[PDB]
Design an enzyme around this catalytic site. Structure first.
Site, mmCIF file in Angstrom:
data_model
loop_
_atom_site.group_PDB
_atom_site.id
_atom_site.type_symbol
_atom_site.label_atom_id
_atom_site.label_comp_id
_atom_site.label_asym_id
_atom_site.label_seq_id
_atom_site.Cartn_x
_atom_site.Cartn_y
_atom_site.Cartn_z
ATOM 1 N N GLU C 93 13.628 72.672 -92.674
ATOM 2 C CA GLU C 93 13.352 72.345 -91.267
ATOM 3 C C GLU C 93 12.511 71.067 -91.158
ATOM 4 O O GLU C 93 12.853 70.147 -90.410
ATOM 5 C CB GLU C 93 12.612 73.480 -90.556
ATOM 6 C CG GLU C 93 13.454 74.705 -90.275
ATOM 7 C CD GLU C 93 12.740 75.683 -89.363
ATOM 8 O OE1 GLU C 93 12.658 75.377 -88.143
ATOM 9 O OE2 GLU C 93 12.269 76.742 -89.870
ATOM 10 N N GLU C 102 17.352 82.046 -87.983
ATOM 11 C CA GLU C 102 17.876 83.022 -88.942
ATOM 12 C C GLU C 102 18.949 83.882 -88.303
ATOM 13 O O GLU C 102 18.886 84.183 -87.122
ATOM 14 C CB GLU C 102 16.775 83.903 -89.519
ATOM 15 C CG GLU C 102 15.981 83.215 -90.602
ATOM 16 C CD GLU C 102 14.852 84.081 -91.103
ATOM 17 O OE1 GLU C 102 15.090 84.928 -91.981
ATOM 18 O OE2 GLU C 102 13.724 83.921 -90.613
ATOM 19 N N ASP C 109 35.959 89.216 -88.303
ATOM 20 C CA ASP C 109 36.776 89.903 -87.296
ATOM 21 C C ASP C 109 36.390 91.389 -87.119
ATOM 22 O O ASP C 109 35.428 91.867 -87.734
ATOM 23 C CB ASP C 109 38.263 89.727 -87.644
ATOM 24 C CG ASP C 109 38.629 90.305 -89.017
ATOM 25 O OD1 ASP C 109 38.097 91.366 -89.423
ATOM 26 O OD2 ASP C 109 39.483 89.694 -89.680
ATOM 27 N N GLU C 129 22.858 77.024 -96.341
ATOM 28 C CA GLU C 129 22.742 77.797 -97.575
ATOM 29 C C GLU C 129 21.559 77.273 -98.405
ATOM 30 O O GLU C 129 21.431 76.062 -98.652
ATOM 31 C CB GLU C 129 24.037 77.694 -98.390
ATOM 32 C CG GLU C 129 24.036 78.417 -99.745
ATOM 33 C CD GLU C 129 23.781 79.907 -99.647
ATOM 34 O OE1 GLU C 129 24.118 80.516 -98.616
ATOM 35 O OE2 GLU C 129 23.242 80.473 -100.620
ATOM 36 N N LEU C 130 20.740 78.212 -98.868
ATOM 37 C CA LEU C 130 19.471 77.948 -99.533
ATOM 38 C C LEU C 130 19.515 78.568 -100.929
ATOM 39 O O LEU C 130 19.750 79.777 -101.060
ATOM 40 C CB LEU C 130 18.343 78.597 -98.731
ATOM 41 C CG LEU C 130 17.383 77.789 -97.856
ATOM 42 C CD1 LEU C 130 17.949 76.467 -97.377
ATOM 43 C CD2 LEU C 130 16.894 78.652 -96.689
ATOM 44 N N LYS C 131 19.299 77.742 -101.955
ATOM 45 C CA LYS C 131 19.104 78.210 -103.330
ATOM 46 C C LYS C 131 17.711 77.846 -103.833
ATOM 47 O O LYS C 131 17.264 76.711 -103.673
ATOM 48 C CB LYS C 131 20.096 77.548 -104.281
ATOM 49 C CG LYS C 131 21.554 77.646 -103.898
ATOM 50 C CD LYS C 131 22.085 79.051 -104.062
ATOM 51 C CE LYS C 131 23.572 79.076 -103.740
ATOM 52 N NZ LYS C 131 24.012 80.440 -103.365
#
Lengths: 225, 66, 226, 226, 63, 67
Positions: C93, C102, C109, C129-131
């Site tokens: 951020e 979040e 579906d 996506e966070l690693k």
């Protein structure tokens, strides 16, 4: 390299180091060590492309410079090796008749890019590598001798040590305190000029590429000290 | 389970061939590697003694004693 | 798909679900998730026989349906990831300037057979996506190569997340708190229609085969949630 | 072969020893067992070199003789197996209708180089192998059946057990206590004379090579029990 | 080993350029990521401040 | 905590009658072993436990083709 020059560039006194010490680890950060150099000299299936194990060590070593830490891989194996190392050394001395001095890390040259940490320096000029395999399986493999007794990673390690120290032979002993007999065995390995030339060719390129990668993210070798 | 006669004998013969002693050389070594204060050969088990003997034989072989 | 269908089928209120809680795990049981879909789209060296990693996931996912539980895999890497995920979101951020909100799970579906759990939804309409790679080694790989050194398993996860949510791009950020500098790096991965087509073909076949296996042993998808 | 010959050879009354026991491990030191024999029968893709898995087991087994100990591999899986084996046996009895008596180790002959430890001996003449797989994944692989439900390591264990005991068929059962239903599944496996011939040729040779290696470093098989 | 002055100035230089503050932005950030209640700028280690600086530099670079 | 419903109880009773087995001699002892608890009455079962027990009876019955 002298003991004051190391202190002068790292702030660490080699005379006061005990293998496993914080200072011992700090001195090897980002340095191409003998235990890992088998990764440096790996060639591919064919062509000029670096294998995964080479790329993996490259990245590992780069991370050491930029983090100032080395995580320990195989905590069980390492604790076992530390538990029995001096017993292995003592028994090597006893059975061989050769006296052993413990050595701090030995850098090959003033760049401090390449080093080894002998498990001993012997009265006859030879270095000493000591292994206490975590499995008696691997002890037995070495102990039985013959074709493929010494894994190529360890031959690379032993030869690199001779490259770094300029020396002509190296003792390679295994110890296993669980063996009811035959628990200490060693061989003498001679300097192999095929290995020396391979290091002479491949190692400088590996150092250069590291310098390029470090520059790309605003780091320079030495920072870690 | 204590050291048998046979094993004691081969140990003692090799110590003499090697010019080493129980008190100065062998018991300190056995104390270090078995992690115990071993003050006499009688304090040694057969298993310990077998290992000790092995080391002495290797020492004798590399020396090339008579 | 809405909070209502999830409530009727699982008993759970998605609005109460924050990443990692008992509820979050329950909602993913038996579901084809982004982290694992690389196994679903694995193809063999020649032919049409399912490679081992695909069969292995099939079996794992079927077991989730029939037991209603899932074991932990890579406990240490996972704990590390949980330890530093919030810091990675914050730092992303801060450095990027895009606000992250979040999200609980998103199903593609009404079937609830397919889903992703974004590490965030961004104010500019991209996912996140966070690693936190367990080894600084793996961080360094990403930091240098960028796009070139994203594992195909990770690339599949990001693409599937866009397949599920319909979005056009996804932030892929790594974080390593051990790095003295340069510990936060991110790239923008764009929606790739070759992947979108692979999922369109392969995933419904996977679902169909799961139903057949479940039927062979007297089970039906949904039993995990009751 | 009796418990009096085992006693004379090892000082261990086989009748007071139960799967898992401290003495149970001593009886297996250096012995080619059914769960490992898959290593012994692995052939090379070409030539005549022993594959890595074979050499690796060769060295492991020799180390057992020379150290008198065998470290425990996969501790969590063994504990799960021990936790659930009796339930697996009872559920097998209950669902199959066949009675099962427990058996200590069974050596093939006086040499004690070869043995199996059946998880049971059934009323109908067959032996019983019981698995409580640590992952429900592997349970599901087996439960679904087909050409490939039984790992080849497991087929070798079963066939070796029949080779050791002269029996013509063996129950192969899996139990998973986490399955909501269908947690116990079994099949019958018949004696396969192709395996019997492989054991007849390959096992005695493996024994000869082990003896030569032990002799190379001054050991005699059987020492680990004196 | 405590934050040095030239590093502290590089940080403050960026805080001013970014129109951010210690109280509102950087102390809360640092407190979260270093798992410690950091009440003033002089309580940063040099290593901690080198990381904070890197992030401010990244934030600035992206505008 | 959720208890055995009457529908499930009935299917269990149907199978016990067809296999010539009883709660007190056969099924309760079995259920006590595999669920690691002292279970002396049918009402001490959870529905999940009862489903398992019902499944084991169905497997037993199906081998014999019983009704």
């Amino acid at each position: 390299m002298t003991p004051d020059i190391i202190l002068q560039r790292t702030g660490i006194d080699v005379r006061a180091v005990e293998q496993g010490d914080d200072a011992w680890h700090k001195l090897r950060l980002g340095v191409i060590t003998a235990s890992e150099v088998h990764n440096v000299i790996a060639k591919p299936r064919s062509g000029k492309k670096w294998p995964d194990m080479k790329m993996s060590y490259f990245h590992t070593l780069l991370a050491e410079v930029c983090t100032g830490v080395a995580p320990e891989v195989n905590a069980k194996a390492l604790a076992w090796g530390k538990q029995y190392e001096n017993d292995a050394r003592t028994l090597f001395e006893f059975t061989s008749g050769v006296n052993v001095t413990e050595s701090p890390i030995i850098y090959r040259d003033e760049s401090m890019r390449t080093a080894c940490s002998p498990d001993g320096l012997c009265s006859d000029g030879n270095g000493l590598e000591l292994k206490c395999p975590f499995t008696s399986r691997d002890f037995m493999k070495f102990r039985l001798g013959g074709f493929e007794a010494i894994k190529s990673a360890y031959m690379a390690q032993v030869q690199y040590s001779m490259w770094v120290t300029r020396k002509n032979a190296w003792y390679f002993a295994n110890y296993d305190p669980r063996m009811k007999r035959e628990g200490l065995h060693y061989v003498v390995i001679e300097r192999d000029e095929k290995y020396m030339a391979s290091f002479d060719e491949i190692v400088p390129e590996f150092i250069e590429k590291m310098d390029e990668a470090l520059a790309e993210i605003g780091f320079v070798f030495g920072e870690q000290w | 389970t204590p050291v048998n006669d046979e094993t004691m004998q081969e140990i003692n013969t090799l110590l003499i061939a090697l010019d080493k002693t129980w008190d100065d050389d062998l018991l300190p070594l056995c104390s270090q590697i078995f992690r115990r204060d071993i003050r006499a050969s009688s304090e040694l088990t057969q298993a310990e003694a077998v290992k000790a003997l092995g080391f002495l034989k290797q020492k004798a072989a590399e020396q090339k004693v008579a």
